[PDB]
Amino acid sequence: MVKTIDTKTRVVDVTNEIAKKKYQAIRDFLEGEEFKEVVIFGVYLWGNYTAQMLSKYADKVYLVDIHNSIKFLNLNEFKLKFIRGEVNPDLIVDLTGLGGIEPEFLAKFNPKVFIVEDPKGVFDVDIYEADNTYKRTAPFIEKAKVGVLKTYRKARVSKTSGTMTLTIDTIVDASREITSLDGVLYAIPNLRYYEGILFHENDIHKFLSEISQPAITISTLNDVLDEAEEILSNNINLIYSFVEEL
Amino acid sequence: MVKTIDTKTRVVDVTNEIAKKKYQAIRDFLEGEEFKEVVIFGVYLWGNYTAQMLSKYADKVYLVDISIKFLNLNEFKLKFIRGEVNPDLIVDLTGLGGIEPEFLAKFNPKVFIVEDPKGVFDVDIYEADNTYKRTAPFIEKAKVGVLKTYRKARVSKTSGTMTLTIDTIVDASREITSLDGVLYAIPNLRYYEGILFHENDIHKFLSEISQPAITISTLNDVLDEAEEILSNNINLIYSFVEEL
Numbered sequence: 001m002v003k004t005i006d007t008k009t010r011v012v013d014v015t016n017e018i019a020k021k022k023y024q025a026i027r028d029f030l031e032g033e034e035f036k037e038v039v040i041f042g043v044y045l046w047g048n049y050t051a052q053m054l055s056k057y058a059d060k061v062y063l064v065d066i067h068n069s070i071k072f073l074n075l076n077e078f079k080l081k082f083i084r085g086e087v088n089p090d091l092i093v094d095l096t097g098l099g100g101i102e103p104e105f106l107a108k109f110n111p112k113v114f115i116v117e118d119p120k121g122v123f124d125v126d127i128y129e130a131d132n133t134y135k136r137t138a139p140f141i142e143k144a145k146v147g148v149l150k151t152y153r154k155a156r157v158s159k160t161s162g163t164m165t166l167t168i169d170t171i172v173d174a175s176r177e178i179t180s181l182d183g184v185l186y187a188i189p190n191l192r193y194y195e196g197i198l199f200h201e202n203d204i205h206k207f208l209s210e211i212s213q214p215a216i217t218i219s220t221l222n223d224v225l226d227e228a229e230e231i232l233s234n235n236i237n238l239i240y241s242f243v244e245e246l
Numbered sequence: 247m248v249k250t251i252d253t254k255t256r257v258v259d260v261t262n263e264i265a266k267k268k269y270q271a272i273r274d275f276l277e278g279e280e281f282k283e284v285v286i287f288g289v290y291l292w293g294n295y296t297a298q299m300l301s302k303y304a305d306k307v308y309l310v311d312i313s314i315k316f317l318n319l320n321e322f323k324l325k326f327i328r329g330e331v332n333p334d335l336i337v338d339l340t341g342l343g344g345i346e347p348e349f350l351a352k353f354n355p356k357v358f359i360v361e362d363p364k365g366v367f368d369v370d371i372y373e374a375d376n377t378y379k380r381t382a383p384f385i386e387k388a389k390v391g392v393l394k395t396y397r398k399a400r401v402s403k404t405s406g407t408m409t410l411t412i413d414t415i416v417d418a419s420r421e422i423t424s425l426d427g428v429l430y431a432i433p434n435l436r437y438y439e440g441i442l443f444h445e446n447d448i449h450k451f452l453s454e455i456s457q458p459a460i461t462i463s464t465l466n467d468v469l470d471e472a473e474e475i476l477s478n479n480i481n482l483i484y485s486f487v488e489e490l
Contacts, residue, residue: 183374
């Protein structure tokens with residue numbers, strides 16, 4: 001009588017939808033401009049889609065983490081490369097967010113375009129004070145075209161614009177909407193701290209397995225698969241990303 | 247700068263507090279009466295705690311699935327047709343798709359307790375429920391009670407321990423998210439019976455159900471506040487047995 005149903009949408013699919021949204025904001029902001037060297041600061045797992053996509057508009061792309069012609073470097077290899085004069089990027093994209101890359105390190109560079117990701121979502125006094133986005137933009141006001149990447153959920157609460165944050169809130173809200181469907185007993189959001197699995201337990205197998213999980217597991221009296229999927233889709237479509245020029 | 251905090255309360259702790267609430271409701275209903283030969287229907291895992299605690303006011307104690315004796319519905323029925331079991335106390339925790347009234351009609355207890363699976367109103371869940379057709383064959387040749395469990399001024403589709411666990415932890419994660427300096431709050435939940443009965447992975451089951459209820463990304467140390475949110479949501483759960 002009581003059925004158990006997994007959604008066909010996985011967590012990685014939600015994550016990809018958001019990554020694609022942020023990337024298209026970036027691609028819209030760049031117009032059709034081509035670069036020789038792109039440097040993207042951020043964690044590999046959230047930045048890889050943008051790196052892979054920007055590689056078609058660049059001769060070389062670096063992904064720098066603070067951990068195919070795309071190179072992956074932690075921040076110290078990159079600093080050694082810079083001091084040696086082996087890197088000088090015309091495009092810089094900072095996706096680090098809260099407690100991320102330092103303004104004085106950025107001030108050393110001279111790109112044609114700088115894009116910084118604003119981590120702030122709905123207002124939070126502590127998150128507001130910890131944010132230093134505009135101190136990161138300050139050193140470029142006479143060096144480059146500066147844009148601030150913003151991502152919000154339309155008329156919803158999200159404390160940050162982070163892909164993980166948005167993923168969590170999207171899937172949790174969807175499980176609560178699904179719960180309210182006729183005949184549904186409950187809806188489990190299948191989520192985990194993925195960065196913890198990959199970067200602090202170094203278990204690629206477990207990471208790939210938990211992130212490939214069905215987004216929602218539903219205990220229900222009715223086949224609500226299609227409705228659950230469209231609910232999940234509606235919440236994904238609530239996410240809006242754009243780059244504001246300074 | 248950005249901290250990651252696991253709550254000290256794990257999912258099993260939530261599960262045990264709900265199971266405990268339901269049990270205290272049941273013994274409040276039994277008012278210290280003692281029995282010998284008790285049968286408890288339900289899925290073992292939700293059905294346990296009640297069995298071992300009822301073992302102190304009883305004896306032989308049976309836990310039947312679809313010290314304490316553990317049974318498949320099959321050994322229990324074969325034992326009954328052969329005439330080796332006749333219980334004075336019956337507690338039915340099977341809920342929505344459980345034991346049929348015609349099979350219950352075969353028994354002759356002094357006391358009967360059935361769990362009402364309905365929570366907040368749902369037309370299909372309401373219709374699928376047949377609690378009172380289960381109470382019908384005893385409706386006073388024996389003392390009959392209905393175990394009801396709700397979240398005060400909150401929505402839950404059933405009174406199931408799994409359901410209440412989920413809704414409690416998810417809601418707690420939403421309140422914790424609203425704290426100043428919190429970036430996000432992950433509710434660590436899993437379909438445990440799927441792991442245990444359908445993948446036969448005791449190690450994976452134990453590992454998953456022992457997970458911290460909530461993993462928090464935050465600027466501030468909010469551990470105590472998170473624990474208190476979680477506790478407040480657990481205390482919203484009210485359980486009682488109504489006498490017919």
